[PDB]
């Protein structure tokens, strides 16, 4: 938690959070929006499949 809070305060994307490949130098504030859009698309895909 200390490491994660440090990363969030400095605005760096946490290493644990970064699981899909991203362009270099990508901050966490835009990473959150990108991940939100990806999750929305994943929910649409899963709802269509189910």
């Amino acid at each position: 938690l200390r490491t994660l809070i440090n990363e969030l305060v400095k605005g760096i994307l946490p290493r644990s959070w970064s699981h899909y490949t991203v362009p270099a130098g990508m901050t966490v504030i835009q990473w959150v929006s990108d991940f939100s859009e990806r999750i929305k698309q994943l929910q649409n895909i899963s709802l269509a499949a189910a």
Partner: peptide, 24 residues
């Protein structure tokens, strides 16, 4: 601390923005 409160607000906003469901 100001950093503590601003991080609380930022994380709460992120929780609001981030979707909360994804079924396998």
């Amino acid at each position: 601390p100001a950093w503590m409160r601003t991080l609380h607000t930022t994380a709460s906003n992120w929780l609001h923005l981030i979707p909360q469901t994804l079924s396998h």
